[PDB]
Scaffold this active site. Structure first.
Site, PDB file in Angstrom:
ATOM      1  CG  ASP A   6      -0.439  -0.821   2.373  1.00  0.00           C
ATOM      2  OD1 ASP A   6       0.784  -1.075   2.465  1.00  0.00           O
ATOM      3  OD2 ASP A   6      -1.277  -1.226   3.209  1.00  0.00           O
ATOM      4  CD  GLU A  15     -13.738  -4.051  -0.384  1.00  0.00           C
ATOM      5  OE1 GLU A  15     -12.589  -3.566  -0.325  1.00  0.00           O
ATOM      6  OE2 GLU A  15     -14.261  -4.361  -1.481  1.00  0.00           O
ATOM      7  CG  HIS A  53      -8.943  -5.569   6.671  1.00  0.00           C
ATOM      8  ND1 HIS A  53      -9.150  -5.088   7.947  1.00  0.00           N
ATOM      9  CD2 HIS A  53      -7.962  -4.801   6.135  1.00  0.00           C
ATOM     10  CE1 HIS A  53      -8.323  -4.084   8.175  1.00  0.00           C
ATOM     11  NE2 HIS A  53      -7.591  -3.891   7.091  1.00  0.00           N
ATOM     12  CG  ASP A 107     -12.127  -6.159   9.690  1.00  0.00           C
ATOM     13  OD1 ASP A 107     -10.965  -6.346   9.268  1.00  0.00           O
ATOM     14  OD2 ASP A 107     -12.832  -5.203   9.311  1.00  0.00           O
TER      15      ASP A 107
END
Ligand SMILES: [Cl-]
Ligand SMILES: [Mg+2]
Ligand SMILES: [Mg+2]
Ligand SMILES: [Mg+2]
Lengths: 265, 264, 266
Positions: free
Chosen positions: B72, B148, B143, B141
């Site tokens: 990223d 997402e 990810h 979560d």
């Protein structure tokens, strides 16, 4: 994935044997185009082997142009030792049929390069294109062959360290653990999945958790057998004792969906 | 999928670093045939980077023919700015090793066409064939990167709008209004395309992710669970991250991987 | 997988229509390069068909270079019979738009070789490469088309025996006479469905609540065929509030916020 719910292990063996004959005779194997069959060992497939033999005795199928691959072999044990996988297969099956020595394939547990022996085997399979039908059983924990739970679904034929539990289980060896082999060569999950058809035999109360995981559970790498849900054509043939952890409606569902195929079994 | 249960984050970093070194040395990279390494940022991989730097200082590995790709980069933030993902990778890793500028790859957050930039990044990966080993962390979560939950398993490199929670988290390093709104991130498919994936997971707040990953079934709400379908995925974890696992689960892998554990 | 949470079936229809319109106009179909659309039947897609028609009448989309394939057809029933899937499609959609006869594809339920007809259908689909967008519904038990639960994800177009539940359901359209209701249908397979570039599934009503839960919160599971969409590259579920009753509050909250921009005006 297909479920065939039968009441007894004897019926499982007959249905499995009937299914293998159906596929051989529809295939019409020749010398150029052999039918290629994956095979297991142990108490479960034994009823299948004896049904097959009698079917052959009755002239209902020939294995002249059937080529076979077994899943497993002990590392280090003489091939002709009564406790080798090879011996299991010849004494319970090959010796009773018109199969050809050149068409029988088993892993060699006693070479000087296991990796190369495992590669040779994968190459041999690939030399026929594809295994047409692969029969198997399932561990109490859903495992296949000597593949551990959490095995990669793309895992290939390789050497495996036998579990402590398996080894004390197999203590055939004069009730002696020191004589039990520490390693086996086994086909991989990916090797399994590459078959055009997979048929899993599931019998006994002890396999009830595994059947549930395979049938009602979702795709999970801890229960290797659940991966068959993603396979194009997979059958499980099971007995009433193996269904104990299923919902009543689940058994009802598959017993009725397969009604036509259950008749005479 | 493999699980490596370790005691503390320090051993996780060291284990991951040893595994990267094993693969590089097994690969024997050259100018013609480089080793391609996918990389993450943040607190968790920091241990791994520092152990790698040590091993390299010890003469145990060279990055001269290693090609890197990061997950990223922020949109709109100067590359040279201290809070950029580029800056994180150089200040904590790249500046310390014998890696070559021409083999370092990061997303450009400031072009006039993000779709093309992302396309460029994917194309360059594919000019090397595949990524040989991809290191990552995982959200609370489950990810991956800025993908997402409920992301497509075939999702590719693309701009993503940062959640208000992630933006709230980063406020310390900038006031909410100067924190970037968008990031460029690799897709789940980008990740899955790698030969091997290693996901580092540390801390009590990843226990639900780890549960889902290891004991849970394949589920698009926990992206990391898709690793179960990957040919070669391994998760390296610490004790606090295992609190939601069954005793038998930890015991299983701890004993399965025992020979690979010793030393750590 | 995408979840688009809407209030009522009316909006689900209008959303699905606008998405179909969006994909056609971005594709820009021609004679050489048609847009290939896969389609369902029944009460749920009806709202989408109506909204599609109103959109076309106002000049927002043209079906001149749209090619269609349908999921299902009864075996043994005259194609012009009011209760055939062909008749549904024509009377509720095709008669109302500028679609071309040669560009319409349905299964023929009345040949002397069902296998050969199913093969012909698959061949035609492949002759266009791929279906660009496939719209469907879901059973209460998560099934797709006439595919059984526990259908292979690789299953292809084939003849299927209707369950007695389904034949009990459709007896009303054959005037309470089950002995009038067709015994078989021809249906596209799950592998057929999954080959589409995009799949959009409509889910309305309190009775689909469990299927939607299995689909969105559940894991990949052959007993709930719709859950395999978690593995498809580009799948979307468009749903109404009644259909969400089995989901967690936070699951609805997540997708409602996630898709807020694509939800406005619906
Ligand atoms: Cl239904
Ligand atoms: Mg003989
Ligand atoms: Mg340097
Ligand atoms: Mg018209």
């Amino acid at each position: 994935m297909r479920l065939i719910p039968l009441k007894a292990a004897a019926q499982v063996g007959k249905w499995a044997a009937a299914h293998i004959v159906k596929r051989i005779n529809e295939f019409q194997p020749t010398a150029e185009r052999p039918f290629v069959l994956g095979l297991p060992t142990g108490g479960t497939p034994l009823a299948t082997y004896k049904a097959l033999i009698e079917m052959h005795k009755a002239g209902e199928v020939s294995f002249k142009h059937v080529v076979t691959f077994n899943m497993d072999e002990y590392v280090g044990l003489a091939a002709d030792h009564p406790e080798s996988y090879r011996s299991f297969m010849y004494n319970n099956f090959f010796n009773h049929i018109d199969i050809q020595e050149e068409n029988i394939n088993l892993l060699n547990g006693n070479t000087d390069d296991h990796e190369a022996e495992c590669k040779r085997y994968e190459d041999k399979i690939k030399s026929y294109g594809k295994i047409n039908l692969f029969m198997g059983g399932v561990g109490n924990d859903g495992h296949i062959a000597f593949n551990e739970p959490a095995s990669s679904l793309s895992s290939r034929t390789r050497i495996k360290t036998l579990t402590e539990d398996t080894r004390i289980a197999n203590s055939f060896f004069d009730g002696d653990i020191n004589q039990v082999p520490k390693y086996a060569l086994t086909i991989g999950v990916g090797t399994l999945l590459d078959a055009q058809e997979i048929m899993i035999l599931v019998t006994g109360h002890n396999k009830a958790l595994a059947l549930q995981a395979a049938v009602e559970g979702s795709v999970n790498h801890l229960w290797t057998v659940s991966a068959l849900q993603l396979h194009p054509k997979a059958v499980i043939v099971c007995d009433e004792p193996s269904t104990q952890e299923l919902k009543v409606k689940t058994v009802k569902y598959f017993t009725e969906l397969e009604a036509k195929n259950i008749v005479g079994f």
